[PDB]
Amino acid sequence: MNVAEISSINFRRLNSGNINVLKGRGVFSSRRLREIYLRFDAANADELRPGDVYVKKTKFDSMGYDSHFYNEGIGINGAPTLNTYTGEYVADSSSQGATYWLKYNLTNETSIIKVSNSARGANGIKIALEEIEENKPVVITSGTLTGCTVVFARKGEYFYAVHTGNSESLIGFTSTSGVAKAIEVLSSLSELEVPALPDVINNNTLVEYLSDNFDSALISYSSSSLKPNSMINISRENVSTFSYYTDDIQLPSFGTSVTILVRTNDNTVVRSLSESYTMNSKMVVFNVLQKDF
């Protein structure tokens, strides 16, 4: 079959709420910015801007990048850290490591939201599940994960996606400051008072926070025994955790973490998938976790 026929099959699978349309097919991201039908709340918390979390309620449009959702340090001349596009071109050359999604697509009836980390902190979105429209499925991608942390979570009729980390090669940041920024964004988006946290905030803190304040969550993250704050040593029944990097799996391997939101049979399906890709000739899936919300 040709690219168009396969891509329409892909759309019909996605539109039935089938997460496996994204299973094994590698990472995807794009810098492209086209307005999609869905409005969501967006928030940014960054060490360079101490104080209130920045919040955006208006739709993402094509009429200029909001600097809170942009990183001048990405690429040769900057790149958005939060953008929306439609699925006729799923991955572009900005997607480090992309494979299948450079060739095939999800058609222009799919709406894609890319959420990256902030230069020194977290970006997040909150989606009202009852606003996902029939035959207009939505995909959230976090791009190529090489040390950052991605949270997907549900509370009531709302879904949250938060990506925290840094682009500045900072020692120890993501498992401490990155967690604090993610908690600030999650709290702002969910209208919760930012908790009085311990002086030491790390990935275990993130598990505890999500468990106590969200119905269900998935954390996809990097950890290593040489970096204790990165290691998760507690467990909570409503928080799944996926260490896409470990003591063995590191760069040039990479993680992926995606969600589909699909209105079908009068209900919004929400399904997430995290993978770890590593060299076998070929990048292979080393580990995977699929969680429904």
Ligand SMILES: [Mg+2]
């Ligand atoms: Mg990072």
